[PDB]
Design a protein around this nucleic acid. Sequence first.
RNA 1: UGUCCCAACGUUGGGCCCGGUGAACUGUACAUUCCAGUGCGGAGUCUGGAGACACCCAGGGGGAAGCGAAGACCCUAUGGA
RNA 2: AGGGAAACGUGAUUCAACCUGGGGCCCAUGAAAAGACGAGCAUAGUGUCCGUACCGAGAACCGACACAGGUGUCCAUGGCGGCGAAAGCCAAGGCCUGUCGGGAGCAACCAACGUUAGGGAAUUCGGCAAGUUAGUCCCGUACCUUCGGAAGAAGGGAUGCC
RNA 3: GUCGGGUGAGAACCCCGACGGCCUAAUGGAUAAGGGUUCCUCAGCACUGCUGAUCAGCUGAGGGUUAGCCGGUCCUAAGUC
RNA 4: GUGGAAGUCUGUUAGAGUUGGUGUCCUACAAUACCCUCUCGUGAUCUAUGUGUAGGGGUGAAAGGCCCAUCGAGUCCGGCA
RNA 5: UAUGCCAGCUGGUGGAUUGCUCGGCUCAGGCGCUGAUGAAGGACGUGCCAAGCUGCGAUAAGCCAUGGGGAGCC
Lengths: 82, 46, 56, 81, 143
Amino acid sequence: ERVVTIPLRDARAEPNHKRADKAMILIREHLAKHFSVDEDAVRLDPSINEAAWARGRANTPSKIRVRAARFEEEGEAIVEAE
Amino acid sequence: GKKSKATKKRLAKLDNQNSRVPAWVMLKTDRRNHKRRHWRRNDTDE
Amino acid sequence: TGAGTPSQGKKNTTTHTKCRRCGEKSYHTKKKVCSSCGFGKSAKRRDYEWQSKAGE
Amino acid sequence: SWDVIKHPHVTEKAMNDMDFQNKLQFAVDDRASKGEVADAVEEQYDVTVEQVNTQNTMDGEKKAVVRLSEDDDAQEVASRI
Amino acid sequence: TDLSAQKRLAADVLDVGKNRVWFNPERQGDIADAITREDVRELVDEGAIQAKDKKGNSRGRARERQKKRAYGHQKGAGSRKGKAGARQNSKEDWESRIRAQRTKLRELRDEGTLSSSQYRDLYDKAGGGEFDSVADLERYIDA
RNA sequence: UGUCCCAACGUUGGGCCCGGUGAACUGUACAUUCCAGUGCGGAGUCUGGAGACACCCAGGGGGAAGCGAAGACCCUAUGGA
RNA sequence: AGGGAAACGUGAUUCAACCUGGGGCCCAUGAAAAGACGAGCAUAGUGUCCGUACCGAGAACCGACACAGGUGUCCAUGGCGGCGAAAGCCAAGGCCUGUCGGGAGCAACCAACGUUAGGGAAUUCGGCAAGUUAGUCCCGUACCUUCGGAAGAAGGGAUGCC
RNA sequence: GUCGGGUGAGAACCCCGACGGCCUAAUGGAUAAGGGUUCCUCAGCACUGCUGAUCAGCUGAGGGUUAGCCGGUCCUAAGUC
RNA sequence: GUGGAAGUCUGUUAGAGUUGGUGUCCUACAAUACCCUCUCGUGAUCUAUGUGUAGGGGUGAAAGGCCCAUCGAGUCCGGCA
RNA sequence: UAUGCCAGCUGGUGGAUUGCUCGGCUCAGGCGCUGAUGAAGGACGUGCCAAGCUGCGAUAAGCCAUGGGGAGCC
Ligand SMILES: [Cl-]
Ligand SMILES: [Cl-]
Ligand SMILES: [Mg+2]
Ligand SMILES: [Mg+2]
Ligand SMILES: [Mg+2]
Ligand SMILES: [Mg+2]
Ligand SMILES: [Mg+2]
Ligand SMILES: [Mg+2]
Ligand SMILES: [Mg+2]
Ligand SMILES: [Mg+2]
Ligand SMILES: [Mg+2]
Ligand SMILES: [Mg+2]
Ligand SMILES: [Mg+2]
Ligand SMILES: [Mg+2]
Ligand SMILES: [Mg+2]
Ligand code: NA
Ligand code: NA
Ligand code: NA
Ligand code: NA
Ligand code: NA
Ligand code: NA
Ligand code: NA
Ligand code: NA
Ligand code: NA
Ligand code: NA
Ligand code: NA
Ligand SMILES: [Sr+2]
Ligand SMILES: [Sr+2]
Ligand SMILES: [Sr+2]
Ligand SMILES: [Sr+2]
Ligand SMILES: [Sr+2]
Ligand SMILES: [Sr+2]
Ligand SMILES: [Sr+2]
Ligand SMILES: [Sr+2]
Ligand SMILES: [Sr+2]
Ligand SMILES: [Sr+2]
Ligand SMILES: [Sr+2]
Ligand SMILES: [Sr+2]
Ligand SMILES: [Sr+2]
Ligand SMILES: [Sr+2]
Ligand SMILES: [Sr+2]
Ligand SMILES: [Sr+2]
Ligand SMILES: [Sr+2]
Ligand SMILES: [Sr+2]
Ligand SMILES: [Sr+2]
Ligand SMILES: [Sr+2]
Ligand SMILES: [Sr+2]
Ligand SMILES: [Sr+2]
Ligand SMILES: [Sr+2]
Ligand SMILES: [Sr+2]
Ligand SMILES: [Sr+2]
Ligand SMILES: [Sr+2]
Ligand SMILES: [Sr+2]
Ligand SMILES: [Sr+2]
Ligand SMILES: [Sr+2]
């Protein structure tokens, strides 16, 4: 378990009316990498969802602080806002 | 529309004919309703 | 307005219906005449020699 | 010569009408009037028919909903057939 | 589980649009067993099913604007969109004025202030559009 | 006033790669061609040279007198309307 | 009576519906019939037969299709807005089915579009395309004219908020 | 659309919640014609569905339309027999 | 000043239509579609349903237009091989 | 030696071929009118389960009589 700051500037590569979606993907990929786990095993708590979609589908926050914990037999992570 | 009693009887019959060939007929004849109709794909008379 | 597809959408009138006398869906409910058997037009049954090859 | 009553119409809805409103339901000849349905019923099960509602069904038959007088008990009438 | 049917019954029993009925996430199994409307009423009381509140547009911002405009503000040239005759119906305005001038003249008469003949002369002049308003009429009557 | 001088950068949907779905047009045969020539005088296929290791991806369409329609123009028929 | 968890209001303005009048127009004159009223009251009996679901449309109709087409009526008084049944935004209500998704700062090229210095129609058969102007008020308005008009001519000024 | 979750052998698109959106003479309500059971329930996914499907206007099996006072029915219109 | 006329003006009100883009599409969403622009919108107006006129005949504010995707003579079958 | 050419082998796809015939085609002989005593035709019904065909008609794949027939039938 640890607190990490996810940069979401790469969502700018996706068309602007769909930035929120891409953000949620970048978040999952960031945690999967930094916590050494499969993207399939990363659980994003709705709090994170609401944070990224706060200004609608076309406006994402530039970064987001997220608190994630890593555990269990198969290796998985649970994440949430902070 | 407005259906008369006769029209209704005819529609009723068409609904009834529009059924499966009983399974036992399958066995008895040791091996299809060629008059199967669909309300959308088909058009009834009258 | 085209005579094709756009004009087909206006067709919701009922004309030919099941005939009381012959059973064919040919009884024109507005003319009250069967285009198939002649019901409403003649007591005799609608018939013509041209409905078959001349020598048959 | 056609008879008036064809057979009892037995379904979930029919049973409810029987348990909650003292009504019996019948499949009857579609040429029969409400009155002819009332008489026929009174003469077949000896009861007092109070009201009869009819419907020409999409099955080609006529369905009758017969309400008996408070004197009679549908549940019991239907139970003897 | 598929609760769309129950959603329909609930909207009817709660007397609200389907989009406003709320089904508790933790009771899908119980709601899924609900077959009859009675089953739905039962779950409603348990609070497993509820009706979300409907929105009503706020009129606060409108009310303030209404006050400013009633006080004669926020109606400068830059705020008008319709033609002058559209902002105030002229025939309608004349009906307002002329009726006010006749009521005026009618009171002065029954009150003795004007003789039927003086009244007549003023009344006919009003009808000819001689007076801009009631005050304009009074000023005239004062010789 | 980007119509133009004279074009640039950006936006959204496609295009490209991946999963699934999945047609049609067209097909005498052969066929990696190019330059000349010849030939019913407008040839990938004949002649002489030149060039040419096989396969695949993307592209804009020069050629196949490309595909689509037994030329509507013109004439002819002891044709039609 | 009913309905509502509860309270279970009172006044006002503007007033669709509906009611009732006044005016004007016609080289145009705006159905007919059954029926009803005229013609009281009590009580009782009778009131049979046919239709009744559902869709009514970017999937239930017609168009070979679950077709971007076509297809009548009424909801024309929901809030802000404004002249408005206009735009734009938002309720009640409906929907995420104008139904394949995943990926590459995602190249060339195409569709639809934003922004372009200086020049300003040189482009082109031709300002084609795009753009310029714009709502409301005040001032002011030519030739010509069938005296109606031309006319919003033109041109000039103003416009928010407190 | 997205994040969680539900069901299921199987879930991007079946259902619940949250967050994010779309429609305002319509993408909402009632209906005429026309269609004809497409309506409701249960059980299903070989077929139909622009991908998938546990879903459905699909497949199997049942069920559903109740009138003195809403239409028809009665009157006559252009006009028809 | 009142009054409120008009085959009167503006108007994507409803509703009707279609100047240009020679845009998009052109094995289409569509055998006549899509978008913007444009025109009409109290009348020789528009619109629903019913009803009448039939093939050398209708109907036509006349384009040889229209009479069920076809009309300088409909469609079907027959004459007919 | 990839992409691949020609021929064959095993297995498909396909339904030709050969064989078969409950259907046709043509010829010959016989026979020949039906209907208000409601025909022919059609509609809708009718079966334990019944969609189609056939039959039948609310007495609904059937009822009665006489003769035939025969231990099976529906
Ligand atoms: Cl008056
Ligand atoms: Cl009705
Ligand atoms: Mg968006
Ligand atoms: Mg059924
Ligand atoms: Mg009834
Ligand atoms: Mg189900
Ligand atoms: Mg005036
Ligand atoms: Mg030729
Ligand atoms: Mg010529
Ligand atoms: Mg000639
Ligand atoms: Mg669709
Ligand atoms: Mg410039
Ligand atoms: Mg030049
Ligand atoms: Mg232009
Ligand atoms: Mg008409
Ligand atoms: Na149909
Ligand atoms: Na029955
Ligand atoms: Na440009
Ligand atoms: Na080429
Ligand atoms: Na308003
Ligand atoms: Na889908
Ligand atoms: Na005057
Ligand atoms: Na145009
Ligand atoms: Na002719
Ligand atoms: Na004979
Ligand atoms: Na059968
Ligand atoms: Sr169809
Ligand atoms: Sr026209
Ligand atoms: Sr059209
Ligand atoms: Sr029509
Ligand atoms: Sr006749
Ligand atoms: Sr004859
Ligand atoms: Sr049924
Ligand atoms: Sr050579
Ligand atoms: Sr290309
Ligand atoms: Sr009033
Ligand atoms: Sr209904
Ligand atoms: Sr509707
Ligand atoms: Sr439509
Ligand atoms: Sr809403
Ligand atoms: Sr789908
Ligand atoms: Sr800028
Ligand atoms: Sr020029
Ligand atoms: Sr020039
Ligand atoms: Sr100006
Ligand atoms: Sr399967
Ligand atoms: Sr359904
Ligand atoms: Sr006008
Ligand atoms: Sr106009
Ligand atoms: Sr043109
Ligand atoms: Sr354009
Ligand atoms: Sr075209
Ligand atoms: Sr007006
Ligand atoms: Sr035609
Ligand atoms: Sr012929």
